[PDB]
Structure 1
Amino acid sequence: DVSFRLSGADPSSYGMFIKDLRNALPHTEKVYNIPLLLPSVSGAGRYLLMHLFNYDGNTITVAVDVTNVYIMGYLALTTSYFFNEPAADLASQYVFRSARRKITLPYSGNYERLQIAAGKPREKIPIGLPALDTAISTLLHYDSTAAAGALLVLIQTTAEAARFKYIEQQIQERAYRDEVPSSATISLENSWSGLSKQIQLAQGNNGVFRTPTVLVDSKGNRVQITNVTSNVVTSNIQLLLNTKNI
């Protein structure tokens, strides 16, 4: 398991959490020095539990699929909540079985469905450590519309930060003041599968992407990533989605 506490949190303690989150994900191989997530894990070992504590010390436990860093569901007191998708229903066979009741959320966990449920795109939803504190608090008591926004915050401040050093740093910059994600953050989130694939395809193609990945950079400029010498590959991405899952 991994844990993060909002009470007394700072960029350093958050960085330690994201480090722990990354290190909890198993891999037997690195591709261009980046850990390659496993094709599959059977049974309960598929799911990492993240214990998150809001500023007041109230807690939720979030179940994360260790092969793709997808959040499947979470436990809040004696109620479990799972996304309305087959992978999450499968997770519900293994985690939070002791919950007195299980609620299936009225949406799947993908950005597009969550944004529809929330009533806004995540371009308009501030993120940061304060937003994470709010998100945890919101998830404590069932409200499906509120929860959708909270989950958009939760996913980006945990999984996406684990996947990209840039996103982790963006949240560290938002330790005491929320701000909507940079266009670069959004671009990286949207391109994780694509980048993961092209980095793996580069292995037998002399470090060269079979298909370029278009990204938005720090300055708001759209750029093309064509090979493994790119800063996105050498410094930024921290976890690769296995091509078997793409």
Structure 2
Amino acid sequence: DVSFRLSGADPSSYGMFIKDLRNALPHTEKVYNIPLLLPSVSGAGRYLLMHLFNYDGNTITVAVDVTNVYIMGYLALTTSYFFNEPAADLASQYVFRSARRKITLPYSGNYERLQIAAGKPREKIPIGLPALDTAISTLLHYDSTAAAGALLVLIQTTAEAARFKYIEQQIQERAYRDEVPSSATISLENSWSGLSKQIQLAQGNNGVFRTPTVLVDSKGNRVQITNVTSNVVTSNIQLLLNTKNI
């Protein structure tokens, strides 16, 4: 299990959390020096538990599928909550079995459904360490509309930061002040599956992508990533989604 405390949190302690999160995900192989997540893991070993503590010291435990870094559900006091999707239902067979009750959220965990439930796109939801503290607080007490927004914050500040160093750094910049995600941040999130695939295909193709991946740079301009020498590959992406899961 991996842990993060918002009480006394700073950029360094957050960086240590994201390092721990990445380090927990199992892999046998690296592709261009980037850990390749496993095709599958059977049983309870599929799920990583993250213990998160808000500034007041209250906690949730979040279940993460170690093959795809997807959040499946979370435990808050004696109640578990899982996304309304088959992978989460399966997870609920293995984690938080001790919960007194299990609530299925009224949405799946994909960004599109969460944004609909929340009433707002990610572009307009501030992220940062204060926002993460707030998200943990929200998730302690069931409100499905508020939780959707909280879960968009939680997913970006854990999973997406684990996937991309750039996103980790963006959250570190927002240690004491929230700010809506940069356009480049959104682009990277949206491209993780595509990049993961092309980096794997590039082995066998001299490091050249079969199909370019289009991103937005931090300044605002659209760029094409065509091969493994790109900074996105050498110095940003930290985890690859297995092509078996794409």
Q: What's the TM-score bracket when you normalise by the shorter of the two chains?
A: over 0.9
Matched, 1:71 2:74: no
Secondary structure at the counterpart of residue 102 of structure 2: strand
How far apart are the structure 2 equivalents of 1:237 and 1:132?
22
Unmatched runs of 5 consecutive residues or more in structure 1: none
TM-score normalised by structure 1 residue count: 1.00
Q: CA deviation at 1:148?
A: 0.1
Unmatched runs of 5 consecutive residues or more in structure 2: none
Identity of aligned residues (%): 100
Q: CA deviation at 1:218?
A: 1.1
Aligned to 1:132: 132
Kindly report which structure 2 residues correspond to 1:49-198, keeping only aligned pairs within 5 A, or say none: 49-198=49-198
Q: CA deviation at 1:40?
A: 0.2
Give CA deviations for 1:179-233 in whole Å, capped at 9, x if unaligned. 0000000000000000000000000000000000000001111000000000000
Secondary structure at the counterpart of residue 97 of structure 2: coil
How far apart are the structure 1 equivalents of 2:206 and 2:123?
36
How far apart are the structure 1 equivalents of 2:23 and 2:87?
23
* Runs of 4+ displaced beyond 6 Å: none
How far apart are the structure 2 equivalents of 1:170 and 1:220?
15
TM-score normalised by structure 2 residue count: 1.00
> What is the RMSD computed on CA atoms of the aligned residues?
0.2
Give CA deviations for 1:80-123 in whole Å, capped at 9, x if unaligned. 00000000000000000000000000000000000000000000
Secondary structure at the counterpart of residue 36 of structure 1: strand
Secondary structure at the counterpart of residue 142 of structure 1: coil
How far apart are the structure 2 equivalents of 1:79 and 1:218?
40
Give CA deviations for 1:145-204 in whole Å, capped at 9, x if unaligned. 000000000000000000000000000000000000000000000000000000000000
Matched, 1:13 2:9: no
Figure out how many residues of one structure are paired with residues of the other and give that number: 246
Aligned to 1:244: 244
How far apart are the structure 2 equivalents of 1:60 and 1:221?
38
How far apart are the structure 2 equivalents of 1:182 and 1:11?
18
